[PDB]
Symmetry: D5
Subunit: 64 residues, 10 copies
């Protein structure tokens, strides 16, 4: 029994964990192309975080 | 192998899932006072999410740059 | 199937795990401000544990 | 890395989930004496939760 | 999906799990009274396991036929 | 960290869930050969349960 | 190693796309629906990038690719 | 989920069970506990032979 | 884990994979997607044959049945 | 609510994890015979990944 706000919260949480993974893998790699690739993915995931927080702000009354 | 920003992100993810749970339990509950209790816990968790987002934007430059 | 008492027990169990996580993160944190923020979150979660225990005792005359 | 209070919190969370399971199994049971056995287990588990809560209040200054 | 015997098997499996956790926590804990508390809990779940085995043998005749 | 009695307890819990699976599959099947195969397996698993409880009673004085 | 990490990220992105599209389908607000569709399109771009990386670092994968 | 799938599931669980029994036998300090785990491992390998037989008799593609 | 335990884990995973492929073939609506999943199931059955051969070769106790 | 494309994506994700497992086992194993076995398994799984990716591109407009 999820609603729209709950699904957005779930996507935001998943995105935050994904950023953790991207940064971990960038640190764990020593090939600079792989490192750069993971850093790029992490930055774009951070854009997704911003977008989901902004959606959450529009929809959720208790947050905004 | 985990730093402060990763820990903040994990706190935030857990808090968001907690809010989902609290709101679902408030909707599901029949006792008005149980409902009010879950509503209170959900509102407090939203306050903590606001604080955690502020911390994350303080510690994660690129996150802040995306206008988090 | 869940009733109110079951949902309160689940909330209490999740709160207890949450406190564990916050205290572990505070112990692991290198930044004193981050440590203080986690300690903050843990103290307020403990307040909610007390409330959830009271509520459980109110609904389950077996105490729990 | 866990400390004593953290172990107590984990045992408390587990016990609460166990109570949920015992009460659900009592409900779902068609044999009334299997029902009775599950209710007896739930009551003994509630007694454990009482003790763990008290221990946690004694060792945790925050009085969760 | 489950009958009474299956729920009893699940309860016994969970109890065995739980004793493992209690005894490990006793071994690991630093305060002698915390460690005694966990030992007492282990002893009480062991009594529960005895009761559950008796219930299981009573309701599962083939299990009883193999003994314990 | 586990000791010998904990490993025996884990194998016992796993066997009990295995019997649950076997009996459920014997019910779910309509082909008599497959039914009987699953019932034979559940019987042999019940033997393993007896043996493990016997080892546990030997090695755990609080269980015996 | 690095190739295993790329494979794990690709699998996670594929599951994420599935989530975004399921949430789009279940959304009641059409603006939320559109948001999940937008996320799905961006994650699909991430999948293309990861497949490219994998094809570059795994000559055995580029063999059939 | 059909009969052949239930048999594949039983066979997979049995193989993982054998692995567990042998790992526990290797990890165990009491030799009688070690031998008990090796006994369970051998019996479970018998179960694997039986499940493979059943799977081949029901799955012509296998 | 030793080599025989790794063979066993691979074989268990392959059997579960065949289950997933067959379930998805049953659930899918596009005929070519159904045929794709059926084809993957057939080739995984071949891998299972190889795994059991390898298991018997390396486990005398299993080979004795 | 899985559709055809979602099932394709899950099969691809599983195949990729499987390739990871095969290469890890090939590394960790002692016998060169089992090494070669796991290598051959990895290679055919990579063929499957290629097939899955083509199916995905074809069902999913948004993929490239
Ligand atoms: Ca994500
Ligand atoms: Ca919580
Ligand atoms: Ca318990
Ligand atoms: Ca228990
Ligand atoms: Ca078993
Ligand atoms: Ca992702
Ligand atoms: Ca088994
Ligand atoms: Ca496989
Ligand atoms: Ca696979
Ligand atoms: Fe994303
Ligand atoms: Fe991504
Ligand atoms: Fe964007
Ligand atoms: Fe919190
Ligand atoms: Fe606050
Ligand atoms: Fe709370
Ligand atoms: Fe207990
Ligand atoms: Fe119990
Ligand atoms: Fe006690
Ligand atoms: Fe047997
Ligand atoms: Fe067994
Ligand atoms: Fe025997
Ligand atoms: Fe078995
Ligand atoms: Fe295959
Ligand atoms: Fe495959
Ligand atoms: Fe394979």
């Amino acid at each position: 029994d999820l609603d729209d706000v709950a699904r957005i919260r779930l996507v935001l949480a998943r995105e935050l964990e994904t950023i953790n993974e991207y940064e971990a893998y960038a640190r764990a790699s020593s090939n600079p192309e792989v490192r750069a690739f993971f850093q790029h993915l992490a930055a774009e995931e951070k854009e997704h975080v911003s977008e989901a927080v902004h959606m959450l702000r529009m929809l959720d009354s208790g947050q905004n």
